[PDB]
Design an enzyme around this catalytic site. Structure first.
Site, PDB file in Angstrom:
ATOM      1  CG  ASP A 136      -2.222   0.948   1.017  1.00 13.26           C
ATOM      2  OD1 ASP A 136      -2.331   1.639  -0.034  1.00 13.26           O
ATOM      3  OD2 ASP A 136      -3.034   1.012   1.973  1.00 13.26           O
ATOM      4  CB  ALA A 140      -2.178   8.890   2.467  1.00 12.98           C
TER       5      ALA A 140
HETATM    6  C1  LIG Z   1       1.712   5.815  11.476  1.00 17.97           C
HETATM    7  C2  LIG Z   1       0.517   6.685  11.184  1.00 17.97           C
HETATM    8  C3  LIG Z   1      -0.688   6.291  11.969  1.00 17.97           C
HETATM    9  O1  LIG Z   1       0.940   8.003  11.620  1.00 17.97           O
HETATM   10  C4  LIG Z   1       0.417   9.174  11.123  1.00 17.97           C
HETATM   11  C5  LIG Z   1      -0.587   9.222  10.203  1.00 17.97           C
HETATM   12  C6  LIG Z   1      -1.034  10.469   9.670  1.00 17.97           C
HETATM   13  C7  LIG Z   1      -2.075  10.582   8.689  1.00 17.97           C
HETATM   14  C8  LIG Z   1      -2.567   9.419   7.901  1.00 17.97           C
HETATM   15  C9  LIG Z   1      -1.716   8.722   7.037  1.00 17.97           C
HETATM   16  C10 LIG Z   1      -2.208   7.795   6.138  1.00 17.97           C
HETATM   17  C11 LIG Z   1      -3.573   7.540   6.083  1.00 17.97           C
HETATM   18  C12 LIG Z   1      -4.107   6.599   5.130  1.00 17.97           C
HETATM   19  N1  LIG Z   1      -4.564   5.855   4.394  1.00 17.97           N
HETATM   20  C13 LIG Z   1      -4.422   8.187   6.970  1.00 17.97           C
HETATM   21  C14 LIG Z   1      -3.921   9.106   7.870  1.00 17.97           C
HETATM   22  C15 LIG Z   1      -2.510  11.833   8.313  1.00 17.97           C
HETATM   23  C16 LIG Z   1      -1.914  12.990   8.795  1.00 17.97           C
HETATM   24  C17 LIG Z   1      -0.885  12.919   9.684  1.00 17.97           C
HETATM   25  C18 LIG Z   1      -0.423  11.665  10.155  1.00 17.97           C
HETATM   26  C19 LIG Z   1       0.606  11.565  11.110  1.00 17.97           C
HETATM   27  C20 LIG Z   1       1.018  10.352  11.603  1.00 17.97           C
HETATM   28  C21 LIG Z   1       2.096  10.427  12.647  1.00 17.97           C
HETATM   29  N2  LIG Z   1       2.620   9.292  13.110  1.00 17.97           N
HETATM   30  O2  LIG Z   1       2.424  11.536  13.110  1.00 17.97           O
END
Ligand SMILES: CC(C)Oc1cc2c(-c3ccc(C#N)cc3)cccc2cc1C(N)=O
EC number: 2.7.11.1
Length: 272
Positions: A136, A140
């Site tokens: 994937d 994003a």
């Molecule tokens: C490891 C993941 C959970 O961490 C983050 C996910 C985020 C997302 C996000 C990314 C991908 C999808 C899809 N498909 C949906 C939402 C958006 C904005 C900021 C983010 C920041 C983090 C972070 N760790 O600061």
């Protein structure tokens, strides 16, 4: 990893409030909340088409992959706890949000855009070196730290032919859509990301013709400068053409004609 309580993550994220407010983002399989544990800011991804047992399989996969996979171009899991997953907070969110300038953040320059492409490719390289297919790869899922270091995320779908075809359609390779599981699929998806990096255009747009970004590979291959993201003042024909050439090679319809991550990585380094 720290085995958190399914409760201590509630009062850190202000009782899981989904407003812009304690909600940074949202995807399939779950919601991403901003929590504050100790003195550390964290991203708590509460898990929420897919069945209840399938979220558990994607929860355990995420843990299993993150246990062995530690690279500066992969996000780090701190722990977990209904199923939660706590990660290191990425102050600059996803590449998708930054390319779209979500919440008014400045457009990334071409210089930063080249460093992120190299970062993401290094992250994928570690994954393939360690015999892991992400499954994937998309902007994003490419996260950005305070220094805009690209950190690849979401290893729930990751694997060390399938009946359950999963992923993001606009980014998927033909064989992936048919249920084939090969790291060559990851290359294809990275080529879509490379096209989003050059154009600042999202892979899918409902109110746009073509709706699918990868259809510009055909548009330009028949009739590129016309597609370079105009929210950049520091891009150049040669480096842009060199990144496109990599995306074009990545977007080869036939998986075996596509380059391996090591070649992609090498080609992106030859850019600078
Ligand atoms: C490891 C993941 C959970 O961490 C983050 C996910 C985020 C997302 C996000 C990314 C991908 C999808 C899809 N498909 C949906 C939402 C958006 C904005 C900021 C983010 C920041 C983090 C972070 N760790 O600061």
């Amino acid at each position: 990893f720290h085995s958190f309580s399914f409760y201590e993550l509630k009062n850190v994220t202000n009782n899981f409030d989904e407003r812009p407010g304690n909600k940074m983002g949202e995807g399939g399989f779950g919601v991403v909340y901003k929590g504050y544990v100790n003195n550390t800011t964290v991203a708590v991804k509460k898990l929420a088409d897919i069945t209840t047992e399938e979220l558990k399989q994607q929860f355990d996969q995420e843990i299993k992959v993150m246990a062995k996979c530690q690279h500066e171009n992969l996000v780090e899991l701190l722990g977990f706890s209904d199923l939660c997953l706590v990660y290191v907070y990425m102050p600059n969110g996803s590449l998708l949000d930054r390319l779209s300038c979500l919440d008014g953040t400045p457009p990334l320059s071409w210089h930063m855009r080249c460093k992120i492409a190299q970062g993401a490719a290094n992250g994928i390289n570690f994954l393939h070196e360690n015999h892991h297919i992400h499954r994937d790869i998309k902007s994003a899922n490419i996260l950005l730290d305070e220094a805009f270091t690209a950190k690849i995320s979401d290893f729930g779908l990751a694997r060390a032919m399938t009946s359950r075809i999963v992923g993001t359609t606009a980014y998927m390779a033909p064989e992936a859509l048919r249920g084939e599981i090969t790291p060559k699929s990851d290359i294809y998806s990275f080529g879509v990301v490379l096209l989003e990096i050059i154009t600042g255009l999202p892979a899918v747009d409902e109110h746009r013709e073509p709706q699918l970004l990868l259809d510009i590979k055909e548009e330009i291959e028949d009739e590129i400068e016309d597609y370079i993201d105009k929210k950049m003042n520091d891009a150049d024909s040669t480096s842009v053409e060199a990144m496109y050439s990599v995306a074009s090679q990545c977007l080869h319809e036939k998986k075996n004609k596509r380059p391996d991550i090591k070649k992609v990585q090498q080609l992106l380094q030859e850019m600078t």
